[PDB]
């Protein structure tokens with residue numbers, strides 16, 4: 539245990555930019571480090587972004603994109619843009635050497651992404667939103 543570092547929460551900008559880096563630990567360097575980002579909800583949890591961190595290539599988020607992520611050394615950086623009040627929640631950083639056998643690593647418990655709601659008025663006493 540204690541071989542995976544990830545922020546428990548993440549502060550997002552007003553636009554909705556939530557970016558954090560979940561590092562992982564491996565016995566060596568390989569071409570395939572499958573990463574996964576999940577969103578947890580009280581009713582159920584669903585998959586979101588996923589790609590193979592190839593040390594000589596970039597992650598592909600063609601399926602369920604709506605997100606951008608980077609990977610360097612042993613730290614994977616995930617950035618989210620467009621987080622509404624409902625979008626705010628938990629994001630799980632996953633790290634799995636799934637392609638090479640015989641696959642053995644760990645997943646991140648998850649970082650909560652926080653966002654700020656801008657208001658056209660100096661206070662919410664009237665016309666709150």
Ligand SMILES: *[C@@H]1O[C@H](CO[C@@H]2O[C@@H](C)[C@@H](O)[C@@H](O)[C@@H]2O)[C@@H](O[C@@H]2O[C@H](CO)[C@@H](O[C@@H]3O[C@H](CO)[C@@H](O)[C@H](O)[C@@H]3O)[C@H](O)[C@H]2NC(C)=O)[C@H](O)[C@H]1NC(C)=O
Pocket residue numbers: 555557558559606607608615616617
């Ligand atoms: C996570 O790491 C990024 C740095 O990653 C940069 O962008 C990634 C998508 C990868 O391609 C990396 O190879 C690249 O170095 C930290 O900052 C990020 O910097 C980039 C570069 O300035 C920002 O995106 C750029 O946007 C311009 C505008 O069109 C483009 O021209 C560039 O091609 C590039 O896409 C990116 O917005 C920025 N991330 C943020 C703040 O959203 C980032 O800070 C770090 N995360 C944290 C907070 O640790």
Ligand SMILES: *[C@@H]1O[C@H](CO[C@H]2O[C@@H](C)[C@@H](O)[C@@H](O)[C@@H]2O)[C@@H](O[C@@H]2O[C@H](CO)[C@@H](O[C@@H]3O[C@H](CO)[C@@H](O)[C@H](O)[C@@H]3O)[C@H](O)[C@H]2NC(C)=O)[C@H](O)[C@H]1NC(C)=O
Pocket residue numbers: 539630645646647648
């Ligand atoms: C955040 O981390 C916790 C850590 O929980 C235990 O995880 C194991 C691997 C070990 O490190 C131990 O020291 C930790 O306390 C994750 O919670 C654990 O999750 C696993 C599955 O992901 C659970 O295993 C289950 O085991 C039962 C057998 O009793 C099987 O029937 C199930 O199929 C399953 O394999 C384990 O019970 C959980 N333990 C705890 C303490 O909760 C947690 O999943 C992770 N967050 C993420 C990535 O979602």
